[PDB]
Design a protein around this motif. Structure first.
Motif, PDB file in Angstrom:
ATOM      1  N   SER A 275      -7.613   1.088  13.586  1.00  0.00           N
ATOM      2  CA  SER A 275      -8.199   1.796  12.693  1.00  0.00           C
ATOM      3  C   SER A 275      -9.073   3.251  13.317  1.00  0.00           C
TER       4      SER A 275
ATOM      5  N   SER B  59      -4.104 -11.299   3.793  1.00  0.00           N
ATOM      6  CA  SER B  59      -4.569 -10.263   3.229  1.00  0.00           C
ATOM      7  C   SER B  59      -3.942  -9.731   1.927  1.00  0.00           C
TER       8      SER B  59
ATOM      9  N   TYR C 281     -11.430  -0.065   7.227  1.00  0.00           N
ATOM     10  CA  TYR C 281     -10.227  -1.037   7.387  1.00  0.00           C
ATOM     11  C   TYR C 281     -10.413  -2.167   6.377  1.00  0.00           C
TER      12      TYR C 281
ATOM     13  N   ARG D 143       0.840  -5.833   6.250  1.00  0.00           N
ATOM     14  CA  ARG D 143      -0.317  -6.751   6.199  1.00  0.00           C
ATOM     15  C   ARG D 143       0.263  -8.111   6.429  1.00  0.00           C
TER      16      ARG D 143
ATOM     17  N   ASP E  88       0.971  -1.206  -0.034  1.00  0.00           N
ATOM     18  CA  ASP E  88      -0.131  -0.187   0.095  1.00  0.00           C
ATOM     19  C   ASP E  88       0.986   1.181   0.126  1.00  0.00           C
TER      20      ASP E  88
ATOM     21  N   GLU F 274      -8.240  -3.302   3.217  1.00  0.00           N
ATOM     22  CA  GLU F 274      -7.519  -4.556   3.706  1.00  0.00           C
ATOM     23  C   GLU F 274      -7.905  -5.945   2.861  1.00  0.00           C
TER      24      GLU F 274
ATOM     25  N   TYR G  57      -4.232   4.502  10.448  1.00  0.00           N
ATOM     26  CA  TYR G  57      -3.824   3.396  11.152  1.00  0.00           C
ATOM     27  C   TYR G  57      -2.588   3.432  12.025  1.00  0.00           C
TER      28      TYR G  57
END
Ligand code: CL
Ligand code: MG
Length: 288
Positions: A175, A67, A148, A63, A29, A152, A205
């Motif tokens: 979150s 995910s 989230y 992560r 991300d 995610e 986050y």
């Protein structure tokens, strides 16, 4: 903007480099993925050429691997992005190519409960997502938990408050609403300095994980696996949880969308995640 420059703003040139880049560690991300959480075609095209040339590309993310597989599953199924080896949960779960955890840093249970009690005391427990090795958990669902789940792309199972004690966790992700990010960040860092890592990783986050672990620890272990000197590795990221691997390697790229603290920890500044970052990294450092 498709350039990569050094601290002085001078473009990095392949012929000026005295180090072959054999491996690239990249955050997902905000780095490899664009704002739409997709891998651009330009990036994809460069990743294909990277595989052809034998350049390893390794994910380094907060992560879980699960995910990640949900976000870029199509690319994984075609063997265009490998998840193994990979650095997950900010290094706390780092896999070699055999899926074996070369780093396995669980959170101490007393600390786990203290973080939990503290979160309830300040009412951010509702925003908490706890990470076990295989599953994530929360205590309620709201607009922030919803936000989230959407990004995610993997929903936590809802559980009661008493159930956390029995869980073996690696991290917690809060979150949070944007209107209490800054202050909540102060309280956590004041309360848990020299106890646990506290990082604002993405948007609002707030992630808490093993104090002596970070993505760069994963980088060292994976480089060691393939007998690659750190001088032949490159890291790229955009977030606070990338600072260690960006400053730990001689060659590192902060994407343009990164904050100033993140950029300053990196050797170089590159294009934004919406501007095909890894494509240009592969061009400059590996000559496509
Ligand atoms: Cl991340
Ligand atoms: Mg990121």
């Amino acid at each position: 903007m498709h350039e990569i420059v050094d601290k002085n703003g001078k473009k990095v040139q392949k012929n000026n480099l005295n180090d072959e880049i054999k491996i690239i560690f990249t955050d997902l991300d905000g780095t490899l993925l664009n704002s739409e959480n997709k891998v651009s075609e330009q990036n994809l095209e460069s990743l294909i050429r990277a595989q052809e040339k034998g350049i390893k590309v390794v994910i380094a993310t907060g992560r879980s691997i699960f995910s990640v597989e949900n976000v870029i599953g199509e690319h994984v199924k075609k063997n265009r992005i490998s998840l193994l080896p990979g650095i997950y949960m900010n290094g706390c779960v780092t896999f070699d190519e055999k899926g074996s955890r070369v780093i396995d840093r669980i959170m101490n249970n007393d600390l786990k409960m203290e973080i939990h009690e503290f979160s309830k005391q300040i009412n951010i427990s509702k925003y908490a997502i706890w990470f076990c090795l295989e599953k994530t958990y929360c205590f309620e669902i709201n607009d922030c938990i919803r936000e989230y789940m959407e990004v995610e792309a993997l929903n936590p199972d809802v559980i009661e408050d008493n159930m956390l004690e029995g869980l073996t966790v690696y991290k917690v992700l809060f979150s949070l609403p944007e209107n209490i990010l800054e202050n909540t960040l102060k309280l956590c860092r004041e309360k848990f300095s020299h106890r646990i890592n506290v990082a604002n990783t993405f948007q609002s986050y707030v992630e808490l994980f093993h104090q002596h672990t970070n993505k760069f620890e994963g980088v060292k272990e994976i480089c060691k696996y393939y007998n690659i000197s750190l001088n032949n590795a490159l890291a790229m990221g955009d977030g606070e949880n990338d600072i260690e691997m960006l400053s730990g390697l001689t060659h590192s790229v902060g994407v343009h969308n990164a904050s100033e603290k993140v950029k300053n920890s990196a050797a170089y500044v590159g294009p934004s995640n919406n501007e095909h970052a890894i494509s240009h990294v592969l061009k400059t450092f590996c000559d496509i």
